[PDB]
Amino acid sequence: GTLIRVTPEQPTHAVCVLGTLTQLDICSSASFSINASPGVVVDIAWPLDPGVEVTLTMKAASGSTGDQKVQISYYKTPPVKALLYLTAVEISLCADITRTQRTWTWGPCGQGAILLVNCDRDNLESSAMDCEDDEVLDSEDLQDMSLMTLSTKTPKDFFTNHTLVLHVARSEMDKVRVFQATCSVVLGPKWPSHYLMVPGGKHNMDFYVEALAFPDTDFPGLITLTISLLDTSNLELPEAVVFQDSVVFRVAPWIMTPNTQPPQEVYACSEDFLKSVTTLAMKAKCKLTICPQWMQDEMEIGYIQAPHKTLPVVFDSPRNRGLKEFPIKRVMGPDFGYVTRGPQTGGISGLDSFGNLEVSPPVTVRGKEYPLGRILFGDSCYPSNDSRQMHQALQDFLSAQQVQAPVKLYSDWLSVGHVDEFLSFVPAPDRKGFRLLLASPRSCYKLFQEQQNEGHGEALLFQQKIKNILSNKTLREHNSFVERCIDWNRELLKRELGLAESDIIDIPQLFKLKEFSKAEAFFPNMVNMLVLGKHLGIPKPFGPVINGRCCLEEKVCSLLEPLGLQCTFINDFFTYHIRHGEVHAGTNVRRKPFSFKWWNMVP
Amino acid sequence: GTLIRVTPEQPTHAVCVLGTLTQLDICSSASFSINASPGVVVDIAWPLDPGVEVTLTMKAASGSTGDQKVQISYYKTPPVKALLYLTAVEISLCADITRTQRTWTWGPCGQGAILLVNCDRDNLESSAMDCEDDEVLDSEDLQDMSLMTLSTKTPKDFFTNHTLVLHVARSEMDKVRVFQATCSVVLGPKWPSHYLMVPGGKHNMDFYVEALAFPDTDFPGLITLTISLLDTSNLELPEAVVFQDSVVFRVAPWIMTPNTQPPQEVYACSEDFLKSVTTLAMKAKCKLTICPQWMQDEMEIGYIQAPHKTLPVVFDSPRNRGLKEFPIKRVMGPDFGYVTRGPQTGGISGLDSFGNLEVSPPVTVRGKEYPLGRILFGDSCYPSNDSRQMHQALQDFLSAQQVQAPVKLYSDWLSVGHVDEFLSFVPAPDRKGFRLLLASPRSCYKLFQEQQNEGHGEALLFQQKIKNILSNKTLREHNSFVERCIDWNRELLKRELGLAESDIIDIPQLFKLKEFSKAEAFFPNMVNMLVLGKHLGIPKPFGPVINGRCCLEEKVCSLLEPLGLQCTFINDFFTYHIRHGEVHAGTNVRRKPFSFKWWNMVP
Ligand SMILES: [Ca+2]
Ligand SMILES: [Ca+2]
Ligand SMILES: [Ca+2]
Ligand SMILES: [Ca+2]
Ligand SMILES: [Ca+2]
Ligand SMILES: [Ca+2]
Ligand SMILES: [Ca+2]
Ligand SMILES: [Ca+2]
Ligand SMILES: [Ca+2]
Ligand SMILES: [Ca+2]
């Protein structure tokens, strides 16, 4: 908004940007009438009372300075004319604010452009994320960036006495970079403002914007870019600002992908195990990449999305065991982004591994819908000197991507400590579209007791007989405490995901307590499975054999077959189980991103 | 929520905390009926279909373990009884959540206790904020803290096999401390969890909680304290959690105090100037403290408030000139809190001085009400190599106190750079309850021109004559650019405070451009005034003398008299004006805090 003050002493000269509101102070220097050239529209809510509001609007840009005029006449005495020469310009900075009112808003009916972190590597043969320099080295790189467009409509000579400057706050320049195209940098970590070399008349200049940081504890994730129109007419004074406009970009969050999303690519380490996963992949329709152990624990493949582009992004875990380089060389690349968090030289724990990191399927909870589901990750029930957690920097980061609003589950009771070890999700053809698989000691005691009741108490696990497993009073106590622990999470998941019992399938699974009374799988942990659509790669439990078949496998089939799930039991025993993890821990999946556009959520 | 599983194999034993929801899984091990002792109420929404929900509620705490029982009978065959022995306890952690549903919410109808930073010094003769140690050294200190209360109702022997532990996340322990009273620490930066020594029966233990950090960029300002009930019955297993409850405190923000709040105490430095402010104070009803120059620029007196207590808190500016120690020795003390921000060894600017920091009066803006008004502070219109700003750490801090939602105004055009130099607010007996005073070159040219018209063009400012001031073409150009700058802010303030023109009074004030074309006051800056209720201490302009009186003083009186304001013109010329500041820059005020409770705002 602007208030021009006019005077009989002499004429006023002023610019009006189309779309702003220009009022007029007629009273300050001195009844009155107003007449203006045809291009000016004087609405006028005359007596010389200062409560009278007089606005001026223009419809077309001027073709020449002082193009349009307003004449205010003051009247017992003869008239006194105060003159005002106006020049109208179009000054509009444009973005994709309708995601295909200078505030960013969530929702299908909100407004605000979207910006991707340029955290992938389109560059020829380098090893750096594209955004860690001040150059656009490849044409393909521009697809990842967001287009912003300055449009001006001015007289041929306007920029004789005006300059436009594009700028970002100092607090946000470390998070964004802006290239101008005919590509060179105009804004970035080094430069917060830049004078545009614009010609008079009708012009358009394209800018390409990338982000350099994902939202975090210290970054809500909004970047503001402003254009300012400056009067540089009087050579003995500074620039005076005449008009300021600006777009607000929101930095796209890193988004995770539940087991219910159609798989696209599988990952593992390098013999018979390797072959069975390679059969599942080929059935699941996805391509396969291999590495020459715990491919689950070191990385998590998410994605970032915007109306113009969407690409997968690896979340490299701060645990830095043998697979440490795999995310930065093999996965990162063209349309494959990269993020990491946490201390990299050491200072982590086992809950920092990404088998401790999962997402739920889309869910609705006492009204609040979570279209991308909710990150699940494990920790203790309270902090003590013995208790473990995922590092605060990872928790903080997942929360700052506000979209899959994380839930803390209880995993510290397990030796290894991964939510993976007691839970999985699977597709289902009805009811919310999935099932929760929770590991269940109750279920396996039931199954074994029924087996001994039907006469098979001499049947051998692995070698232990059913009769002995059930009579073992310590095994039972251990598995009761483990039931308490899993049950605590059952109810967490129930509350935080809005699940009912009919959303949940118990899978027979027995546990044992070992070092520091932490829990480990008594036989191969079936819930630690690889979900490749409806083709499931479950660990071979090597269960009691009744009627020419493992009664364990049989029970799971009874449970998952009627959901249209096809169970394959992979042998991972000497290769994986005895080393504290299973099929799910020896693998990873790239899955299809949600169709639902994260920015349409109202978190 | 809890789901107890009952079995014919043998009786189940379980605790139920009053106020939780206990359901029953009758189907897992195996028509049926339920009968329970009188203390249990079985609502029951029978056939043995697993879709049948069976909850149990208790009304009184048990007097002894397994006090209450539920008997589930299974029935062609004769009955099979599964038994369940329940023990009910009261476990309730209490706070002042109704500020005189385990989420903190803003508003007159929301919920959540409030926590003060213990940033004052009640301690005898020390020099440290109370909260920088793990001791409560004085009884008086407990008034600043918030009371939390654990109530238990259990059988005399319950804590034979259960322990309660109080805890805070590791991410929040550095921001809170908790003392237990009969006072010693149980939680804090060192300790995230603690085992409570509670006796069976009916007990209550008081805790006293203080906060150690104000909300900031890295602290939204919520602290969560949780109690956990742990079963420690089986000596060969870890503790199993049975019940978790928790209160959420919000850390009270630092709140600033507009010129419209009744003054309580004035501050200055040590001759005739000093005496005139001492007359104004004594009329304004407030006490006076003095220091043996720019008392405005180094500190800002705000306050923190909670239902139990409210105290003033100094905001010591990172500029560290001669007055650097004044906030930490003279102001800080009993019921006088302390905060600071920004780099303290150097790395600041003049916009960092707190004459660059003001608040508006309470205001409403296109619907959104701001009951505590809005922080105003100055910066440039865009960032260049020459432009100045208030340090990001100060801006970040003021914004994180979400309450007086800051507005950036344009002050970098002034030499010194303070919003103080072009604006003040004053009480008014009508219309929103105040006036905005903006400095106005327009007004003074008008006044002088009218004076020369009425024959006084030989009248002497200071020595310059009116005739010459008006004929001076450079003075005029300078004052036009300065008008552009003040006008830019007029409209900012109009938009961001919802002001209309009738909220604003122009005060005649002429400026000159000097070093680097920055602006300074041509004569004593009248808008830089000390507002002590309705008693105003304005700088003596030493204006042209007409009719035995400065026509400048006269104009201001014409302007402020009819608002019931009493102008006193203090001479600060050789003492203050010639050193780049005025009365407002040579002073400070403690003012009465808003009656409106900040937590009732919906920011
Ligand atoms: Ca680049
Ligand atoms: Ca790229
Ligand atoms: Ca890594
Ligand atoms: Ca790309
Ligand atoms: Ca994972
Ligand atoms: Ca203390
Ligand atoms: Ca205290
Ligand atoms: Ca200081
Ligand atoms: Ca106190
Ligand atoms: Ca101030």
CA distance to A112, A115, A303, B190, per residue, from A99 (Å): 7, 11, 18, 48
Look at the block and give the residue holding tokens 């304005």. B538
Q: How far is A184 from chain B (nearest CA, A)?
A: 19
CA distance to A37, B423, B450, per residue, from A73 (Å): 14, 33, 21
Residues near A487 by Cβ (< 8 Å), separated by ≥ 6? B3
φ, ψ of residue B494 to 5 degrees: the values are -60, -50
CA–CA separation, A440 and B211 (whole Å): 43
Nearest to A357 by CA among A265, A472, A259, A495: A259
Q: What is the distance of C-alpha B398 from the center of its chain? A: 9
CA–CA separation, A24 and A54 (whole Å): 5
Q: What is the distance of C-alpha A23 from the center of its chain? A: 44
Query: 3-class DSSP state for residue A145?
Result: coil
Q: What angle do CA B253, B126, B336 make, to 5 degrees?
A: 30
Examine the domain organization and report whether A511 and A556 are in the same domain.
yes
CA–CA separation, B112 and B102 (whole Å): 8
Look at the block and give the residue holding tokens 């546990």. A511
φ, ψ of residue A599 to 5 degrees: the values are -70, -15
How many C-beta atoms surround the C-beta of residue A69 within 10 A? 15
CA–CA separation, A168 and A227 (whole Å): 9
CA distance to A447, A470, A484, B80, B431, per residue, from B28 (Å): 12, 17, 15, 14, 72
CB B316 within 8 A of CB B327: yes
Residues near B193 by Cβ (< 8 Å), separated by ≥ 6? A382, A383, A384, B165, B166, B167, B168, B187
Examine the domain organization and report whether B281 and B301 are in the same domain.
yes
Examine the domain organization and report whether B115 and B262 are in the same domain.
no
Query: 3-class DSSP state for residue A90?
Result: strand
Q: Which residues of A touch B513 (CB under 8 A)?
A: 237
Look at the block and give the residue holding tokens 């929900």. B53
CA–CA separation, A549 and A535 (whole Å): 20
Give the E-state strand segments of A37-168 in sequence order.
Answer: 40-44, 54-58, 68-74, 80-94, 113-115, 146-154, 162-168
The two structure tokens encoding residue A512: 């044992």
* Residue that terminates a domain, selected from B205, B226, B251: B251
Query: 3-class DSSP state for residue A192?
Result: coil
Query: 3-class DSSP state for residue B416?
Result: coil
CB A588 within 8 A of CB A266: yes
Q: Which residues of B touch A228 (CB under 8 A)?
A: 381-382
HSE of B479 in the Cβ direction (CA atoms, 13 Å)? Answer: 22
How many C-beta atoms surround the C-beta of residue A100 within 10 A? 6
**Secondary structure (DSSP) of A293-358:** --TTTSEEEEEEEETTEEEEEEEE-S--STTTTHIIIIISBTTBEEEE-S-SSS---GGGSGGGEE
Nearest chain B residue to A6 by CA: give it.
B442
The coordinates were experimentally obtained by X-ray
CA–CA separation, A550 and A567 (whole Å): 13
Structural domain for B78, as ranges: 1-94
Put residue B582 in one of left, alpha, beta given phi > 0 → left and psi -120 to 50 → alpha: beta
**Secondary structure (DSSP) of A253-279:** PPB---TTSPEEEEEEE--HHHHHHHH
* A244/B167 Cβ within 8 A: no
Nearest to A552 by CA among A487, A476, A456: A456
**A147 forms bridges with which residues in the sheet?**
A208
- With b for 16 or more beta-carbon neighbours within 10 A and e for fewer, the B87-112 pattern comes to bbbbbbbebbbebeeeebebeeebeb
Examine the domain organization and report whether B479 and B411 are in the same domain.
yes
Instruction: Measure B118 CA to ligand 7 centroid, in angstroms.
Output: 5
CA–CA separation, B339 and B328 (whole Å): 10
Q: How far is B37 from chain A (nearest CA, A)?
A: 26
CB B221 within 8 A of CB B253: yes
Domain count, chain B: 3
Nearest to A507 by CA among A523, A520, A492: A523
- For chain A, what percentages of helix, strand and coil (3-state, to nearest 5) are there? 20, 35, 40
Burial class of residue B468 (count of CB atoms within 10 Å of its CB; 0-12, 13-18, 19+): middle
Residues near A403 by Cβ (< 8 Å), separated by ≥ 6? A253, A255, A372, A598, A601, A603
Instruction: Measure A296 CA to ligand 5 centroid, in angstroms.
Output: 6
How many C-beta atoms surround the C-beta of residue B38 within 10 A? 7
Q: Which residues of B touch A5 (CB under 8 A)?
A: 442
CA–CA separation, B559 and B542 (whole Å): 18
CB B592 within 8 A of CB B262: yes
The two structure tokens encoding residue B86: 């329940």
CB B266 within 8 A of CB B281: yes
**Secondary structure (DSSP) of B337-366:** EEEE-S-SSS---GGGSGGGEEEPPSEEET
CA–CA separation, A444 and A442 (whole Å): 6
End-to-end CA, chain A: 33
Domain harbouring B32, CATH code: 2.60.40.1860
| Rg of the Cα atoms in chain B | 33
The two structure tokens encoding residue B573: 């010329």
* Residue that terminates a domain, selected from B223, B251, B279: B251
Reported for A596-600, long-range contacts at CB under 8 A and 24+ positions apart, including other chains, are: A596/A362, A596/A371, A596/A372, A597/A99, A597/A305, A597/A307, A598/A252, A598/A253, A598/A255, A598/A305, A598/A372, A598/A403, A599/A99, A599/A106, A599/A110, A599/A112, A599/A114, A599/A250, A600/A106, A600/A107, A600/A108, A600/A371
Antiparallel, parallel or unpaired: β B375-379 and B357-359? antiparallel
* Residue that terminates a domain, selected from A251, A280, A311: A251
CA–CA separation, A397 and A379 (whole Å): 16
CA distance to B178, B187, B456, per residue, from B175 (Å): 11, 10, 66
The two structure tokens encoding residue B509: 């004030």
Nearest to A12 by CA among A29, B395, B283, A269: A29
Q: What is the distance of C-alpha B58 from the center of its chain? A: 43
Q: How far is B448 from chain A (nearest CA, A)?
A: 13
CB A414 within 8 A of CB A519: yes
Q: How far is B233 from chain A (nearest CA, A)?
A: 11
The two structure tokens encoding residue A277: 């996963």
CA–CA separation, A13 and A1 (whole Å): 17
Query: 3-class DSSP state for residue B590?
Result: strand
* Residue B216 amino acid letter: D
Examine the domain organization and report whether B12 and B80 are in the same domain.
yes
Nearest to B30 by CA among B65, B85, B61, B74: B74
* Residue B85 amino acid letter: Y
Instruction: Measure B530 CA to ligand 10 centroid, in angstroms.
Output: 11
CA–CA separation, B66 and B39 (whole Å): 12
Instruction: Measure A194 CA to ligand 1 centroid, in angstroms.
Output: 19
Cα dihedral A287, A292, A294, A300, rounded to 10, equals: -50
CA–CA separation, A594 and B211 (whole Å): 42
Burial class of residue A382 (count of CB atoms within 10 Å of its CB; 0-12, 13-18, 19+): buried
End-to-end CA, chain B: 33
Q: How far is B29 from chain A (nearest CA, A)?
A: 8
Examine the domain organization and report whether B220 and B276 are in the same domain.
no
CB B434 within 8 A of CB B497: no
Antiparallel, parallel or unpaired: β B287-291 and B263-269? parallel
Nearest chain A residue to B493 by CA: give it.
A1
Query: 3-class DSSP state for residue B104?
Result: coil
CA distance to A16, A493, B120, B133, B139, per residue, from B126 (Å): 62, 51, 11, 12, 16
Q: Which residues of B touch A51 (CB under 8 A)?
A: 502
Query: 3-class DSSP state for residue A113?
Result: strand
Q: Which residues of A touch B382 (CB under 8 A)?
A: 165, 167, 193, 226, 228, 241
CA–CA separation, A148 and B181 (whole Å): 61
CB B114 within 8 A of CB B252: yes
How many C-beta atoms surround the C-beta of residue B197 within 10 A? 10
Nearest to A327 by CA among A556, A564, A122, A129: A129
Q: Compare CB distances from B488 to A241, A389, A413 and report the shortest one's residue.
A: A241
The two structure tokens encoding residue B588: 């400070």
Look at the block and give the residue holding tokens 């539940």. A258
Give the E-state strand segments of A328-374 in sequence order.
Answer: 337-340, 357-359, 363-365, 368-370
CA–CA separation, A291 and A348 (whole Å): 24
Query: Which residues of chain A come before a gap where C and the next N are over 2.5 Å apart?
Result: 30, 45, 75, 100, 182, 270, 292, 462
The two structure tokens encoding residue A10: 């002499």
CA–CA separation, B52 and B41 (whole Å): 16
How many C-beta atoms surround the C-beta of residue B13 within 10 A? 16
Domain harbouring B196, CATH code: 2.60.40.1700
CA–CA separation, B250 and B224 (whole Å): 9
Instruction: Measure B126 CA to ligand 9 centroid, in angstroms.
Output: 14
CA–CA separation, A332 and A299 (whole Å): 11
Query: What does the H/E/C string look like for A477-537?
Result: HHHHHHHHHHHHHHHHHHHHHCCCHHHEEEEECCEEECHHHCEEECCCCCCCCEEECCEEE
CB B403 within 8 A of CB B601: yes
Q: Compare CB distances from B167 to A50, A383, A491 and report the shortest one's residue.
A: A383
CA–CA separation, A302 and A314 (whole Å): 6
CB B32 within 8 A of CB B112: no
In the DSSP assignment, the letter for residue A403 is: G
CA–CA separation, A275 and B301 (whole Å): 72
The two structure tokens encoding residue B271: 């001759």
Domain harbouring A463, CATH code: 3.75.10.10
CA–CA separation, A156 and A67 (whole Å): 13
Query: 3-class DSSP state for residue A319?
Result: coil
Q: How far is B308 from chain A (nearest CA, A)?
A: 30
Examine the domain organization and report whether B23 and B157 are in the same domain.
no
CB A73 within 8 A of CB A81: yes
CB A388 within 8 A of CB A417: yes
Q: Which of A191, A381, A472, A496 to mutate to test the interface with B (most CBs of B within 10 A)?
A: A381
Instruction: Measure A314 CA to ligand 4 centroid, in angstroms.
Output: 14
Look at the block and give the residue holding tokens 């724990």. A349
Look at the block and give the residue holding tokens 């803290």. B145
Examine the domain organization and report whether A219 and A320 are in the same domain.
no
The two structure tokens encoding residue B53: 């929900």
Examine the domain organization and report whether A164 and A16 are in the same domain.
no
Nearest chain A residue to B492 by CA: give it.
A1
The two structure tokens encoding residue B431: 């219309």
Look at the block and give the residue holding tokens 């302390």. B338
**A305 forms bridges with which residues in the sheet?**
A310
Nearest chain A residue to B400 by CA: give it.
A218
Burial class of residue B133 (count of CB atoms within 10 Å of its CB; 0-12, 13-18, 19+): middle
Nearest to B388 by CA among B399, B396, B397, B377: B377
CB A447 within 8 A of CB A558: no
Number of residues that make up chain A? 603
Instruction: Measure B326 CA to ligand 7 centroid, in angstroms.
Output: 20
Examine the domain organization and report whether B525 and B583 are in the same domain.
yes
CA–CA separation, B372 and B365 (whole Å): 13
CB A482 within 8 A of CB A511: yes
Nearest to B228 by CA among A412, A381, A407, A377: A381
CB B436 within 8 A of CB B490: no
* Residue A7 amino acid letter: T
At how many Å resolution was this determined? 2.6
CA distance to B93, B181, B209, B597, per residue, from B148 (Å): 7, 11, 7, 21
Nearest to B313 by CA among B333, B297, B293, B295: B333
| Rg of the Cα atoms in chain A | 33
CA–CA separation, B122 and B141 (whole Å): 6
Examine the domain organization and report whether A238 and A223 are in the same domain.
yes
* B218/A502 Cβ within 8 A: no
CA–CA separation, B288 and B548 (whole Å): 34
Look at the block and give the residue holding tokens 């972190």. A117
CA distance to A54, A163, B440, per residue, from B505 (Å): 20, 33, 9
Examine the domain organization and report whether B69 and B206 are in the same domain.
no
Antiparallel, parallel or unpaired: β B287-291 and A12-17? unpaired
